[PDB]
Enzyme design. Structure first.
Site, PDB file in Angstrom:
ATOM      1  N   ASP A  60       0.937  -1.264  -0.021  1.00  0.00           N
ATOM      2  CA  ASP A  60       0.082  -0.008   0.081  1.00  0.00           C
ATOM      3  C   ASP A  60       0.931   1.358  -0.034  1.00  0.00           C
ATOM      4  O   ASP A  60       1.279   1.646   0.971  1.00  0.00           O
ATOM      5  CB  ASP A  60      -1.087  -0.024   1.140  1.00  0.00           C
ATOM      6  N   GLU A 118       5.535   5.923  -4.510  1.00  0.00           N
ATOM      7  CA  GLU A 118       6.741   5.528  -3.663  1.00  0.00           C
ATOM      8  C   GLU A 118       6.811   3.971  -3.646  1.00  0.00           C
ATOM      9  O   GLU A 118       6.892   3.351  -2.801  1.00  0.00           O
ATOM     10  CB  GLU A 118       6.639   6.036  -2.162  1.00  0.00           C
ATOM     11  N   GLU A 206       1.528   6.483  11.742  1.00  0.00           N
ATOM     12  CA  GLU A 206       0.662   5.675  10.689  1.00  0.00           C
ATOM     13  C   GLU A 206      -0.696   5.336  11.768  1.00  0.00           C
ATOM     14  O   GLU A 206      -1.942   5.357  11.290  1.00  0.00           O
ATOM     15  CB  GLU A 206       1.041   4.728  10.245  1.00  0.00           C
TER      16      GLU A 206
HETATM   17  C1  LIG Z   1       1.430   4.449   2.898  1.00  0.00           C
HETATM   18  C2  LIG Z   1       2.469   3.908   3.631  1.00  0.00           C
HETATM   19  O1  LIG Z   1       2.726   4.410   4.815  1.00  0.00           O
HETATM   20  N1  LIG Z   1       3.092   2.642   3.345  1.00  0.00           N
HETATM   21  C3  LIG Z   1       4.054   1.966   3.840  1.00  0.00           C
HETATM   22  C4  LIG Z   1       5.200   1.949   3.171  1.00  0.00           C
HETATM   23  O2  LIG Z   1       6.067   3.348   3.153  1.00  0.00           O
HETATM   24  C5  LIG Z   1       6.247   0.844   3.622  1.00  0.00           C
HETATM   25  O3  LIG Z   1       7.456   0.727   2.697  1.00  0.00           O
HETATM   26  C6  LIG Z   1       8.786   1.055   3.251  1.00  0.00           C
HETATM   27  O4  LIG Z   1       8.741   2.369   2.507  1.00  0.00           O
HETATM   28  C7  LIG Z   1      10.123   2.902   3.011  1.00  0.00           C
HETATM   29  C8  LIG Z   1       9.951   4.519   2.940  1.00  0.00           C
HETATM   30  O5  LIG Z   1       9.571   4.791   1.365  1.00  0.00           O
HETATM   31  C9  LIG Z   1      11.149   2.271   2.436  1.00  0.00           C
HETATM   32  O6  LIG Z   1      12.291   2.826   2.853  1.00  0.00           O
HETATM   33  C10 LIG Z   1      11.092   0.879   2.590  1.00  0.00           C
HETATM   34  O7  LIG Z   1      12.290   0.356   1.630  1.00  0.00           O
HETATM   35  C11 LIG Z   1       9.716   0.256   2.364  1.00  0.00           C
HETATM   36  N2  LIG Z   1       9.801  -1.176   2.801  1.00  0.00           N
HETATM   37  C12 LIG Z   1       9.305  -2.127   1.938  1.00  0.00           C
HETATM   38  C13 LIG Z   1       9.228  -3.398   2.339  1.00  0.00           C
HETATM   39  O8  LIG Z   1       8.806  -1.849   0.944  1.00  0.00           O
HETATM   40  C14 LIG Z   1       5.763  -0.302   3.897  1.00  0.00           C
HETATM   41  C15 LIG Z   1       6.520  -1.394   4.493  1.00  0.00           C
HETATM   42  O9  LIG Z   1       7.380  -1.143   5.719  1.00  0.00           O
HETATM   43  O10 LIG Z   1       4.800  -0.297   4.811  1.00  0.00           O
HETATM   44  C16 LIG Z   1       3.494   0.343   4.232  1.00  0.00           C
HETATM   45  O11 LIG Z   1       3.412  -0.250   3.003  1.00  0.00           O
END
Ligand SMILES: CC(=O)N[C@@H]1[C@@H](O)[C@H](O[C@@H]2O[C@H](CO)[C@@H](O)[C@H](O)[C@H]2NC(C)=O)[C@@H](CO)O[C@@H]1O
EC number: 3.5.1.52
Length: 314
Positions: A60, A118, A206
Site C-alpha cells: 500500500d 513511492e 501511521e
Molecule cells: C502508505 C504507507 O505508509 N506505506 C508503507 C510503506 O511506505 C512501507 O514501505 C517502506 O517504505 C520506506 C519509505 O519509502 C522504504 O524505505 C522501505 O524500503 C519500504 N519497505 C518495503 C518493504 O517496501 C511499507 C513496509 O514497511 O509499509 C507501508 O506499506
C-alpha cells in the site's frame, strides 16, 4: 437555457511509476485543458490503477498528483492516495475520485501534470487519469491558489513527528483586498510505527490517532482529527492477504487521503495574518524507527473580480 455542459479531459494513459534502472517513480506530461475557467463550477480528478493478476508492487504505497505553476515552475500537490494492497482500483469503475476544483486556475491551457508513487519494485503501479470539468455558474468568477506548506515529496519526506522541536510550520499569508471568500485546503497523512506506542500497540504516525490544530493569528482556529475512516468498509475490499481493514490515523490503503477545507474569516481579507500548523504533542523515543506527517496546505482566494494569488512569507 443551454444545458450546462461537462467536459472530460484524458491525460495520463496507462503510465507507469516504477523503481529500477531505466525506471521512474514519477511520470509527467503536458495536456491540453480548455483555456477559460471563469464558468468552471467543479473539476473531478479520477485515478484508475490497473493492477491485474498481481502484476504490481503489492504494497500500500504513498502516491500523489501535481499540477505545475506555469509561471513559477513549482509543482502543487492536487491529490494524494494510498495504493491498495495487491490489487488496483478495478472495484471502482471510474477509479479513485478527488475534487481538484481549487486548482481550476492552474488547469487551463497546456498544463503539465506529474504522478508519483513511492514504489520500490520494478513492477511499480500503472495509472490512467482523466478529469471532469463541469461548467455552470460558480459563485465567484475568479480564484487563485498558492501553497502555504508542502512537505510531500514522499511519505518519509513529510515533517518529522516527535522530535524535540518541529520547525517549518509557521508562515504569514497576505490575502488580496478584493478577496470575497478564502479558505485553506489541507492533505495530511502519517507514516511509521514509532515508539512509544499508544494503547493498543499503535505507533506513530501511521497508527496513533491524533488531532492537529491550525492557529490563525495565534488563535487555535481549526482542528484536524486524524481518526478512523472505516477502512473495513472500503469498496476496494479485495485487498487481502494485505492488512487493509484496520483503521490508520486519517487514511486507508486503497483510498484517497482526505482533503480538509477550512473557511477563513472574512475579517482576514486585505490583511497579512499568521498561519501555524501544530501537530498534537508527542515524543518519539527513537526505539522503533521514524514518524512523519506528509502535508500540503494551500490557501485559496475567490472573488468576482480578478484576484491575484495570496502571498506567503515566513
Ligand atoms: C502508505 C504507507 O505508509 N506505506 C508503507 C510503506 O511506505 C512501507 O514501505 C517502506 O517504505 C520506506 C519509505 O519509502 C522504504 O524505505 C522501505 O524500503 C519500504 N519497505 C518495503 C518493504 O517496501 C511499507 C513496509 O514497511 O509499509 C507501508 O506499506
Amino acid at each position: 437555457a443551454p444545458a450546462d455542459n461537462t467536459v472530460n479531459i484524458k491525460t495520463f494513459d496507462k503510465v507507469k511509476n516504477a523503481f529500477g534502472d531505466g525506471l521512474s517513480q514519477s511520470a509527467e506530461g503536458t495536456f491540453t485543458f480548455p483555456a477559460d475557467v471563469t464558468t468552471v463550477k467543479t473539476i473531478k480528478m479520477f485515478i484508475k490503477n490497473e493492477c491485474p493478476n498481481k502484476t504490481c508492487d503489492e504494497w500500500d504505497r504513498y502516491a500523489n498528483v501535481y499540477v505545475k505553476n506555469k509561471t513559477t515552475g513549482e509543482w502543487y500537490e492536487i491529490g494524494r492516495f494510498i495504493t491498495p494492497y495487491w490489487v488496483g482500483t478495478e472495484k471502482l469503475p471510474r477509479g479513485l475520485e478527488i475534487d481538484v476544483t481549487d486548482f481550476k486556475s492552474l488547469l487551463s491551457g497546456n498544463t503539465e501534470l506529474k504522478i508519483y508513487t513511492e514504489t520500490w519494485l520494478a513492477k511499480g503501479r500503472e495509472y490512467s487519469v482523466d478529469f471532469d470539468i463541469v461548467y455552470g455558474t460558480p459563485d465567484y468568477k475568479y480564484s487563485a491558489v498558492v501553497p502555504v506548506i508542502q512537505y510531500n515529496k514522499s511519505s518519509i519526506d513529510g515533517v518529522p513527528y516527535g522530535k524535540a522541536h518541529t520547525l517549518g510550520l509557521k508562515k504569514n499569508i497576505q490575502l488580496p483586498t478584493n478577496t470575497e471568500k478564502a479558505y485553506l485546503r489541507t492533505t495530511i497523512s502519517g507514516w511509521g510505527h514509532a515508539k512509544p506506542y499508544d494503547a493498543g500497540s499503535r505507533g506513530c504516525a501511521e497508527w496513533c490517532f491524533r488531532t492537529h490544530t491550525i492557529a490563525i493569528n495565534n488563535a487555535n482556529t481549526f482542528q484536524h482529527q486524524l481518526g478512523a475512516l472505516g477502512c473495513s468498509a472500503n469498496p476496494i475490499n479485495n485487498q487481502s492477504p494485505g492488512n487493509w481493514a484496520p483503521d490508520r490515523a486519517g487514511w486507508c490503503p486503497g483510498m484517497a487521503v482526505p482533503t480538509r477545507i477550512d473557511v477563513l474569516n472574512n475579517s482576514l481579507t486585505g490583511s497579512t495574518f499568521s498561519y501555524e500548523y501544530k501537530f498534537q504533542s508527542w515524543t518519539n523515543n527513537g526505539t522503533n524507527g521514524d514518524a512523519f506527517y506528509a502535508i500540503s496546505s494551500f490557501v485559496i482566494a475567490k472573488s468576482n473580480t480578478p484576484i491575484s494569488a495570496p502571498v506567503v512569507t515566513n
